[PDB]
């Protein structure tokens, strides 16, 4: 069998995309964020404290009637931007785009932090990383992807995300009208429970490319593109009067620049992000200062190959027994 879903961008500038998924029955459609970088199921539901919930739609496990209270067990998780979530866990029957899951961890909500509740487009989070990342105690609970893998015509899942347009996320099959030219894999380690590889390069906009191992993961619930001091120093170096601005958190350019491309490794194939792509507008309201879509990972401790990456290519997330990510021009 295999699923079919479009994700939206939540906004303007990408900050996140949104999938519908059907939870229970009769089926209640939330619009959940579809997230490699994690691995939990959570929702805003009927248990979650009614001043952090600010209209979204909220899951009601006790109208469900394929519902059953996983009893005794919980969650608590926190993200690398701060945000966090925690609550008691129901299985129930979870579809994407038509693929059903019968019995798959909902994990809902009984407190929010306020990044969640200021995302009324966001119901909650999907995630697609590695079963070893899930909180759920003292029963660690498997992803979607790995609950549906054995019905899967094929163990694997992808992400063909938009630039400022909807995209579509497969599962149990590669459609090859989605991409040009091949799709390049390359090995993943499953050691921090992430996607995650090593890109082979870089380049800026025209310039040579420069041939280094850059270890990341492939992170679809990550809205940047995070790299080394280095690499992001020299991509803003090509941009007039680009800084680094504590005040504001990061990279700032001025808003009349014309962005160069980016290009990064995956083995011997390349992937060239437009310039457009690394631009997330003024840094508040009619500002002159524009956000940069290449941030340094200096802080966060690990690469990131965030939405501003990935939205650049057809991306194959290979669940076989030896994981591999494939990359492909689109």
Known sequence: ????????????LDDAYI????????????????????SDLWVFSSETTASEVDGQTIYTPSKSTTAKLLSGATWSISYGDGSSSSGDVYTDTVSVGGLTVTGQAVESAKKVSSSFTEDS????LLGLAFSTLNTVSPTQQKTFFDNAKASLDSPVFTA???????????????????????????AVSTKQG???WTSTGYAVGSGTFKSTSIDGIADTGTTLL???????????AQVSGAKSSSSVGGYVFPCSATLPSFTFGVGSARIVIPG???????ISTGSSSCFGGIQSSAGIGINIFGDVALKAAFVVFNGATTPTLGFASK
């Open 276 to 282: 457009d792509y690394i631009d997330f507008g003024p």
């Open 1 to 12: 069998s295999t699923g079919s879903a479009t994700t939206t961008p939540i906004d303007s």
């Open 19 to 38: 999938t519908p998924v059907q939870i229970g029955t009769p089926a209640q459609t939330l619009n959940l964020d579809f997230d490699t970088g994690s």
């Open 121 to 124: 487009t966001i119901d909650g």
């Open 160 to 186: 063909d995300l938009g630039y400022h347009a909807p995209g579509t996320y497969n599962f149990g099959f590669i459609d090859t009208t989605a991409y040009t030219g091949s799709i390049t894999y390359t």
């Open 226 to 236: 995070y790299l080394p001091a280095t690499v992001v120093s020299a991509y803003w």
């Open 194 to 196: 992430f996607w995650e």
